[PDB]
Amino acid sequence: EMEKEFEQIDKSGSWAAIYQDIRHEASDFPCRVAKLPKNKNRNRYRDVSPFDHSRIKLHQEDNDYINASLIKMEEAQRSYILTQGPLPNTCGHFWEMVWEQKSRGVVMLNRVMEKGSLKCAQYWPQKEEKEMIFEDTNLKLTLISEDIKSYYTVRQLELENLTTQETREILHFHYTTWPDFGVPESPASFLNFLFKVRESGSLSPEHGPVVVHCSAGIGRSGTFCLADTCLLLMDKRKDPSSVDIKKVLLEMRKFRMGLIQTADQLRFSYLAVIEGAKFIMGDSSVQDQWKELSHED
C-alpha cells in the first residue's frame, strides 16, 4: 500500500532516491518539431518541449506548432492537455487549441508574475468591459464573472470563434499560491481545488481534455494530473491499494517530459492521493473538511 510505502520512504529519507530512479527510467522520445528553428519563439524554455508523437497540432496551414502535449490515460479513461504558460505571441494559438480540442476548462497553477520575472502572459481579460481579441486566430475572449478565494480564483469566460460567431463557456481555475518548484500549502487546499474542478464538470468525458498549465507545464501541472489520475484509478479498481503512483507517473511521462520536478513534489503527490483516498473510500465528510482546512476567502 502507498500508505506504508510512503511511511518507509519517509522514515528512511529516500525520496531523492525514488525520484532519481523515476528520472532515470523516464521515456525518451524525439521532439523534432519543437526544435525546428521556425518554432523557437513558440517555446518558453529551451529544455522543455513536447514529444512529437503526443504533441497537440493546431488546425492551421501556416504553422501547427504549440508547446502542448496530450496525456491519454487509458485505464483511468481520462485525457489531459499539458502546456506551457502562453507567451505574448502564442496567446492566440493557446485559445485556438482550447477551441479546436473542445476543452471546457483551463487549469492554471502559476502566476503571471513569479519571483519578479514573468513566467506567463496575461492571456485572459481582467475586466468584464475589456474583452480580448486574438487577431491571428480570429477569436474573442470575454470575462463573464470571477469568484476570488484566498488561494485560488474561478473565472467564467466566453470564447467566441469570430469566423462562425459560435460561442462557448470556458471555466478558468487559477491556483494562485503554488510556487515554481514548490508545493501547495497542504493536501487539503490542493484537494479542495481539484474537487472544485471535478465538480464543475470540466473533466467530464463529454468535453474535450482539460487544459492544464503552469510555467513550463511539467512540474506543477504534472503533480496535478498525477494526483487526479491516481484517485481515478483507486475508484475504478477492485483493489484501491493496487495503485503504484511511481508506475502511473512513468506512464504519464511517456506523453510529456519531466512531469513532477522535485522529490518534494513527488512526496506531496503521495500525500494528496493518500488523503484523497479517504473521500473515495466513502466517508464524504472529508470533502467539507478540506474546504475548512484550506480556509478559502
Piece in contact with ligand SNA (CB under 6 A), picked from 50-58, 66-74, 123-131, 212-220: 212-220
According to the binding rule CB under 6 A, does residue 45 interact with ligand SNA?
Answer: yes
According to the binding rule CB under 5 A, does residue 145 interact with Mg ion?
Answer: yes
Piece in contact with ligand SNA (CB under 6 A), picked from 45-53, 60-68, 198-206, 227-235: 45-53
How many C-alpha atoms does 117 have within 13 Å on its Cβ side? Answer: 6
Q: Indicate which single residue of 121, 258, 267, 278 sits in contact with ligand SNA (rule: CB under 6 A).
A: 258
Active site residue 120: no
Least distance in angstroms from the C-beta of 260 to ligand SNA: 9
The residue whose grid cell reads 466517508 is 283
Is 215 marked as a binding-site residue? yes
Across 227-244, b (16+ Cβ under 10 Å) vs e yields: bbbbbbbbeeeeebeebe
Least distance in angstroms from the C-beta of 51 to Mg ion: 41
Q: Indicate which single residue of 125, 184, 187, 217 sits in contact with ligand SNA (rule: CB under 6 A).
A: 217
Least distance in angstroms from the C-beta of 267 to ligand SNA: 15
- Report the partner that residue 46 touches, choosing among Mg ion, ligand SNA, none (CB closer than 5 to 8 A by kind): ligand SNA
Q: Which residues contact 145 (CB under 8 A, 6 or more apart)?
A: 128, 155, 156
According to the binding rule CB under 6 A, does residue 184 interact with ligand SNA?
Answer: no
Is 180 marked as a binding-site residue? yes
Options 31, 120, 214, 230, the catalytic residue: 214
According to the binding rule CB under 6 A, does residue 220 interact with ligand SNA?
Answer: yes
By CB under 6 A, name the binding residues for ligand SNA. Answer: 40, 45-48, 110, 180-181, 214-220, 258, 261
Could you list the residues known to form a binding site for substrate, using ranges: 180, 214-220, 261
